[PDB]
RNA sequence: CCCGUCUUGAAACACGGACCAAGGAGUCUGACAUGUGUGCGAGUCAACGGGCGAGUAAACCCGUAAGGCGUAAGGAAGCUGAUUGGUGGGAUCCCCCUGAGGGGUGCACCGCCGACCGACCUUGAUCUUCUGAGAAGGGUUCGAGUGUGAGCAUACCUGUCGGGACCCGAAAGAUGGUGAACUAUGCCUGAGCGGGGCGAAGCCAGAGGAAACUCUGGUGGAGGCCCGCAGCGAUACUGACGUGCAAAUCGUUCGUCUGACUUGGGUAUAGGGGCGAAAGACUAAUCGAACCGUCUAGUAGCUGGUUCCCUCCGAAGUUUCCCUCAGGAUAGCUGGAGCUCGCGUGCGAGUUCUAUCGGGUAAAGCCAAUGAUUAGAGGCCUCGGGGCCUCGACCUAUUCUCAAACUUUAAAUAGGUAGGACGGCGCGGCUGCUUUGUUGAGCCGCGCCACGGAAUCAAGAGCUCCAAGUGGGCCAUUUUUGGUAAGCAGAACUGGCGAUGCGGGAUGAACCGGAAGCCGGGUUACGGUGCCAAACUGCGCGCUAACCUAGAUCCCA
RNA sequence: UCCGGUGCGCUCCCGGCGGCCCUUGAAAAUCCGGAGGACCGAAUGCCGUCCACGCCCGGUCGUACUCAUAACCGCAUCAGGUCUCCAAGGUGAACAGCCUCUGGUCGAUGGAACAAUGUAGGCAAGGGAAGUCGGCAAAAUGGAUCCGUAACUUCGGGAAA
RNA sequence: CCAACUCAGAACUGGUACGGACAAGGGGAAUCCGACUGUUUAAUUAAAACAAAGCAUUGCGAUGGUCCCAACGGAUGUUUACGCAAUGUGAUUUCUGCCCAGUGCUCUGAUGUCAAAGUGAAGAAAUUCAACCAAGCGCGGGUAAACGGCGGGAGUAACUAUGACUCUCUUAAGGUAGCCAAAUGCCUCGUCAUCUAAUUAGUGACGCGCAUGAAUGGAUUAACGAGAUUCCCACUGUCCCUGUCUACUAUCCAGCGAAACCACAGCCAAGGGAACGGGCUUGGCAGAAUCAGCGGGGAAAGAAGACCCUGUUGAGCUUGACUCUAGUCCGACUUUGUGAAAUGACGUUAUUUUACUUAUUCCGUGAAUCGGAAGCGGGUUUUUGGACCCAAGGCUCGCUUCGCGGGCCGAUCCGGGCGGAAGACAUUGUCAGGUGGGGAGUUUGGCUGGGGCGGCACAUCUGUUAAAAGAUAACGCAGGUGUCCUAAGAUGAGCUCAACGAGAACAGAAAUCUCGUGUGGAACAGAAGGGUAAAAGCUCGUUUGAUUCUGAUUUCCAGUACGAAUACGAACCGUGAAAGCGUGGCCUAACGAUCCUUUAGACCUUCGGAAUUCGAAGCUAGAGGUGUCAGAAAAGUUACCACAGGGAUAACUGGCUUGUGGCAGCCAAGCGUUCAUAGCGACGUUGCUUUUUGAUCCUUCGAUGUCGGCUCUUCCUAUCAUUGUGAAGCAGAAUUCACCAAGUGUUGGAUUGUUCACCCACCAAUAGGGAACGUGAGCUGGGUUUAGACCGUCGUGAGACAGGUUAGUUUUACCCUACUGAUGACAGUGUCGCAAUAGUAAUUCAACCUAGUACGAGAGGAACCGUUGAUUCACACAAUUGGCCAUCGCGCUUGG
């Protein structure tokens, strides 16, 4: 046999991300004294499109805390943000869509996005268009907070983690059908070299476990175990179940 | 009939070979072995080295407790370690005698039987340091032993084996390198793409309506939309070409043509890796694993080739074992080397004779067992069958026909043994075996006898060493299995071909004759004598008349 | 070496508007402008000056020619392959085809005959696929204007029916 | 006053010509497949294959999923579930049934099995034992849009037929909705309808469907297609049936000028022969040199057959093959320190939970207000798309003074942690166990009337083949063997069996008992053969010779081993009064080396510095096994394929044979109203043929191009028609049988790739065959038979299918010969002739007349002669008609 397609991606080469026209990483300010204790005011200058990213981005200008200069930032735009709007980041920032607050200051039931996992990591959760996290409860004793992630999982994060109030703008993107291979071509042209996909059963045995045979068929269970080595781990990896998700399974 | 070649079989419609020159294939080396030559000999070897020396890679000299091989073997080992020959044949010589003679001598070699050393077993008087010594006495056991050494060095042929290993030849495997100037895909930066057709949303005007909204005309120019130029691509003619213009082109005809579009340059991915809208595609005319060098003269039970002359001898396709069936080893067949003897008194023979022994095929047998099988006849006692009758069972004597796996009997052919000096007789002796018993058994000594104890032949007999080739067979008379049969397949005895020409069968590997140095003469074999074509249209009798191509010679058509 | 006209004309450049995207379509050198006003002259001679004019200076390497039916690659002076710029008149919807001007060129070894077979291009009485595996090949249709246009349909088409 | 070019209409006019050249859709009715656009095997496959939007499933919350990496690290990721990664299906519309037993995947963790380390015990110790003991496996649950699967028999309703219904075996579930002789149906050219004059085709139906079926997606579907298929209209040189025109070749010349190929060569018939000769045998024959063509032959060239087989050659691929491996999971030790508590074991000490931060790991930043304590406030910036830096001010020293330079406040103090998280876990290193076709290496017997499948003829016994010693083959024939037995072994004694006859309550064909006859007709473990009667059989008694130690011999055979057997010797025993017998089974089969392991035996030998005791190593004899049985450790596939070879061996022709196929004869039971033989020929029996198929394997594997059709010639006769005749159950007409006879002819079509077949139609007739199953350098390429692709069945899979389907490069002649024509030669030259010999050709039908005649009850119904035409064929020819034009002859006409 030869190295299968799934194995060739890890080496990089022609499978690296297409990032030539990207505007840069979108993240909160670096945690500093101003945000830990009070609040810092910023102004939205423009809402821009980032190739490969559905969610729009917002350029925000801040006054540097101790240097005579402007401080430029790039935030994942929340639904409702507009140019010329004042954005407040810090512990004492008011609860309004667009402001960035620590989870400690956000009451239960609030909708937040770009939630930090580690205090100061500048945002890792709920960053895609139309996605958000829901604050469940606070634990003053442990100093931790419970939030519901877009996938429906509940996670414990320290109360110092920051989050932007509101949901990510651009929601409803995936509802529209593409209708065309060309539209998919343009979508993935600015993401990475992952499209089109050739089915394993259409290949020869040399390059895929599903290949070969006088009929197109897998010939063995497509569910493969977790510990299968690379090149053997194709199909439904460590599937707890298969088939149509009916009843409580699709909850 | 063309050579070479594999082959049961080649002039072959089996392969190599257009022609000439030159080159072109059993070698070198290590080990061992038999044989032969040479030296010395219970020894032998100058081999590492030293002393020297043709001013010198030679030659010459040196082995003082060197070393190798030999001089002693047996045992796993601890250990022990050759008491030193008897006999039947036999070369040569000596004496007598002049016989296929009789005595003495008895080497080499062979047969037979003891003894000695050791492993194993067995045995133990008398001693001893308690485990040893050994008076005597052993064994269907075992040994590459002993019983007055034969080795060592060296030369060369041949043979086995390792190596490039007679020469040339794989598909592969490994190692280390080089390519993305083609092509595949991503990325960066540029460039390129007539004229037409359809007429989406939005917009204007008019008309209808209670409203909702509806209708008509225009405007507008949407789209992996249509026709189509360039570009890109490549469907058909299965057209041309097919030693081409071209290792993919040419002609006409075709697909697509604002997009998943086309294209330049830059840049990234490298060989079990890349890349792949996926054809195992593509990765520089190379891809179901590229290219280059090396390992490498890779290995081949397989194909091809393998170089002068005469002379002599001269095969095998069979046995056993083998992951053995295209191979190998083994035995047989063969050559070379001899050696031991012998000269007709031969002790030999693919032959017979005499005497004697075994056999179960051919035939025969069923009126003999076992099995198969036809018909009547008598008795009809007793059993069943049916209607006293009656058929069949039964019993007796007969009768037709049979057998590779039936048989009383039983050939032909073939098989075994014997026909003297290794015989016989007489008198003695030995024994632990044997017997009631010097009774037997075998052996030993002495003496005597033994015209060779059927025929024929005997270009003689015996013994050993080393080694080649071969281990595909085929044909025929006869016996014979499978098969309808076969120029089919498989066995038995012999011959033949293969390896072999020559005369005859027109022609033919096998049929008939017959086997061969180079010639002259003579005569034949098989076959022939009208011509072809050497020899009669010879001398005799009969048969045949074919208007079907009358008929015309084993195998044989 | 002069005086005018004309345009859904062609090539290039620019302007402005609109359509399209789950596609929004580089960077840096360099240059310009701005906010701020530390510091600085003169009592009028100094200071400042991106103004005008005058004066001086200008490295290294490439530069011929072909760019292709003969200068590149394909073993060749090979009907193949190889990026791009300029683009006249007529016919016509048209950088279609056909003809012409500028420029280029007659470079493909020549001569004589006019058999078969061939290759390429044609035509054909009457019949009209009977040919053949099969309408292969060829023929027929073709532009434009007007009229007219079915089944079916995802209502968009089908349709140049 | 100046304007450009679009549209509409009218008159006139030409031989109805006018998009006049150029340019430039054929159209329609349907089936199959794929939605579409797109992409694909550069140089044989453009497609139904790939992709696609849509749909569905799976993993993953960063201490992560997937992947790369020798290591360090890295890709996804400038990312964060509307995301990334891994799969299947394949627009829309309608749907997507049942099965979790099997194979996977997965969840769970009082519970068997389960490694190293560690722990305990015993021992002089090496070591041994026990306990404890991770993951995994096992056990239990889930999961089919995971791999996949989804059934038989019999009865049964007012004619039959059918089976709602009932009975019964049974599965994890028994194929549901649909669909179908389908690109899926063997039978099959299925049945019915439709299309045609005729249809193996097409379409629509029917369905117990060899072997349909639901995201291995089922059923549909507008639009689209250089995709497969059928029909209709138009159109035509595709054809009937060829003809002709132009150009360039060929041809001839000047100049220039190769190559393939070549044993020698080149006329035939038959024969024999390696079974298909240019050479040989016997014949026919045979006359210099040369030109243009031609494809019969040279089993022509091109290439050490790619098919098939063999080899102790490979390679790609697969997996339930053997042996391994990266990775990954898991445990121990290490990194690795500081505490506490609970519990447990013996001041130490295990286990569990938890605390500490400095090791270690991670996150953030241009390391920019961290920790503590004070002041202050109570119980520092948020209507606005501006601006924000380098300190004002106060206090206080120096001062080379009203100007410079410092200090402290403004701007709290203190703290030797840049900020945060996890934390002795994780991580790293080492070993241990599990998993591991992701990956590596390798294997995948032999015999064989080719190989495979089957079988075992591979070790092995009896009878026979086997030809009266021995030996003797086949995938010959009929059978047997891998065991069984403390007796079924040994020995002694007594007894006699099978069967039959005649007798005895129940009792009979057959229970038990009595007498008689009884050569074995019984029994003796098993196959068969042989052998045995006071026994080798049967019943009893005593017993272990089924024992120990060698050697020898036989069978096999190389005169090796093994197995088996036999005769002795030396011991110890059994049995019998004793002789004697007994070393397994009455005899002929019933079995196994080296190495290794294990056991038994010998107050045995060695552990090499000397000893002792363990342990180990030897000597002798057995046991654990190799059945491919003289004894490797071993699964597939290749249609992507490779190499060495093989005509030692298959797939053609030819050759032998002729069972089978085809054709023919003899006898005469019977049929034929009567009547064996006009015409037939049962039961038997004798042949021929090589146009059937088999059998064989002789020729060819350094290659003889492998179906059919087309085209073209020749040959055969076993005669379909035509000429001449005989026979009849021959009145006529028609028909049948037979004779001479191969001169002439034997056709046009639908369906099928076909050969074959079948139908329609015509005809005098629509006979049968050969020539390497004639004929591919003659064509064609539909089929078969490479590589792409689809279905069904089969297989875990790679893949397989004398199953279906669709797309798939057909090369070379100029050599010799043959044949066709062309010059020349043939003794000066020319004209006119003769002539051997060879070739050869004509053919069939119809009408009229005979004649409504002969004949016949009637129906019906001929023929010769003669006349006039026609068919097939042949050889010529162009007056006429028709065809061809570059007469480039004349005219017309488009664009320039
Ligand atoms: K690989
Ligand atoms: K891609
Ligand atoms: K796909
Ligand atoms: K498969
Ligand atoms: K040969
Ligand atoms: K041969
Ligand atoms: K030859
Ligand atoms: K010396
Ligand atoms: K010993
Ligand atoms: K050698
Ligand atoms: K490679
Ligand atoms: K071999
Ligand atoms: K007899
Ligand atoms: K008898
Ligand atoms: K041999
Ligand atoms: K220049
Ligand atoms: K060129
Ligand atoms: K037709
Ligand atoms: K397109
Ligand atoms: K699936
Ligand atoms: K299941
Ligand atoms: K299951
Ligand atoms: K197509
Ligand atoms: K010339
Ligand atoms: K391969
Ligand atoms: K740790
Ligand atoms: K594996
Ligand atoms: K007895
Ligand atoms: K064997
Ligand atoms: K026959
Ligand atoms: K062949
Ligand atoms: K030919
Ligand atoms: K095609
Ligand atoms: Mg997809
Ligand atoms: Mg494929
Ligand atoms: Mg695989
Ligand atoms: Mg042969
Ligand atoms: Mg020869
Ligand atoms: Mg021949
Ligand atoms: Mg050969
Ligand atoms: Mg040759
Ligand atoms: Mg020479
Ligand atoms: Mg010495
Ligand atoms: Mg001793
Ligand atoms: Mg060599
Ligand atoms: Mg290998
Ligand atoms: Mg490139
Ligand atoms: Mg388009
Ligand atoms: Mg188009
Ligand atoms: Mg269209
Ligand atoms: Mg062609
Ligand atoms: Mg084609
Ligand atoms: Mg030319
Ligand atoms: Mg790599
Ligand atoms: Mg591509
Ligand atoms: Mg393939
Ligand atoms: Mg190389
Ligand atoms: Mg063996
Ligand atoms: Mg050979
Ligand atoms: Mg016999
Ligand atoms: Mg007999
Ligand atoms: Mg007889
Ligand atoms: Mg041989
Ligand atoms: Mg021979
Ligand atoms: Mg003859
Ligand atoms: Mg005469
Ligand atoms: Mg140019
Ligand atoms: Mg115009
Ligand atoms: Mg033009
Ligand atoms: Mg015509
Ligand atoms: Mg006409
Ligand atoms: Mg017509
Ligand atoms: Mg056509
Ligand atoms: Mg239509
Ligand atoms: Mg398509
Ligand atoms: Mg392509
Ligand atoms: Mg191709
Ligand atoms: Mg093609
Ligand atoms: Mg769908
Ligand atoms: Mg690492
Ligand atoms: Mg579909
Ligand atoms: Mg389902
Ligand atoms: Mg279960
Ligand atoms: Mg343990
Ligand atoms: Mg466990
Ligand atoms: Mg059904
Ligand atoms: Mg069906
Ligand atoms: Mg039909
Ligand atoms: Mg038809
Ligand atoms: Mg369907
Ligand atoms: Mg449709
Ligand atoms: Mg297309
Ligand atoms: Mg001839
Ligand atoms: Mg010849
Ligand atoms: Mg020829
Ligand atoms: Mg020719
Ligand atoms: Mg070959
Ligand atoms: Mg070959
Ligand atoms: Mg081999
Ligand atoms: Mg072999
Ligand atoms: Mg291999
Ligand atoms: Mg493997
Ligand atoms: Mg075999
Ligand atoms: Mg066979
Ligand atoms: Mg005999
Ligand atoms: Mg015998
Ligand atoms: Mg007995
Ligand atoms: Mg015995
Ligand atoms: Mg006694
Ligand atoms: Mg026995
Ligand atoms: Mg044994
Ligand atoms: Mg020692
Ligand atoms: Mg054997
Ligand atoms: Mg043969
Ligand atoms: Mg030929
Ligand atoms: Mg005749
Ligand atoms: Mg009559
Ligand atoms: Mg005839
Ligand atoms: Mg047809
Ligand atoms: Mg024939
Ligand atoms: Mg033929
Ligand atoms: Mg031919
Ligand atoms: Mg051909
Ligand atoms: Mg043919
Ligand atoms: Mg074909």
Curated annotation (Swiss-Prot):
Keyword tags: Cytoplasm, Ribonucleoprotein, Ribosomal protein
GO cellular component terms, semicolon-separated: cytosolic large ribosomal subunit
GO biological process: one example: cytoplasmic translation
Coiled coil: none
Subcellular location: Cytoplasm
Origin superkingdom: Eukaryota
Disordered: region residues: 1-23
GO molecular function, one term: structural constituent of ribosome
Annotated family: Belongs to the universal ribosomal protein uL2 family.
Protein name: Large ribosomal subunit protein uL2
Native organism taxonomy: Eukaryota, Viridiplantae, Streptophyta, Embryophyta, Tracheophyta
């Amino acid at each position: 046999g030869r190295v299968i397609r799934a194995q060739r991606k890890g080496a990089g080469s022609v499978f690296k991300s297409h990032t030539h026209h990207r505007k840069g990483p979108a993240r909160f300010r670096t945690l500093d004294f101003g945000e830990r204790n009070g609040y810092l005011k910023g102004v939205i200058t423009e809402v821009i499109h980032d190739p490969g990213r559905g969610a729009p981005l917002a350029r925000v200008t801040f006054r540097h805390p101790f240097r005579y200069k402007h401080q430029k930032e790039l935030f994942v735009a929340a639904e409702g943000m507009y140019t010329g709007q004042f954005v407040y980041c810090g512990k004492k920032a008011t609860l309004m869509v667009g402001n960035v607050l620590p989870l400690r200051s956000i009451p239960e039931g609030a909708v937040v996005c770009n939630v930090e996992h580690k205090v100061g990591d500048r945002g890792v959760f709920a960053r895609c268009s139309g996605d958000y996290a829901i604050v469940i409860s606070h634990n003053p004793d442990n100093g931790t907070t419970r939030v519901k992630l877009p996938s429906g999982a509940k996670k414990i994060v320290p109360s110092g983690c920051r989050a932007m109030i509101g949901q990510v703008a651009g929601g409803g993107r995936t509802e529209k059908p593409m209708l065309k291979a060309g539209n998919a071509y343009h979508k993935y042209r600015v993401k990475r070299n992952c499209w089109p996909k050739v089915r394993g059963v259409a290949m020869n045995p040399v390059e895929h476990p599903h290949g070969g045979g006088n009929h197109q068929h897998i010939g063995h269970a497509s569910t493969v175990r977790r510990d299968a080595p690379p090149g053997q781990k194709v199909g439904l990896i460590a599937a707890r179940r298969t088939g149509r998700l009916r009843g409580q399974a699709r909850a």
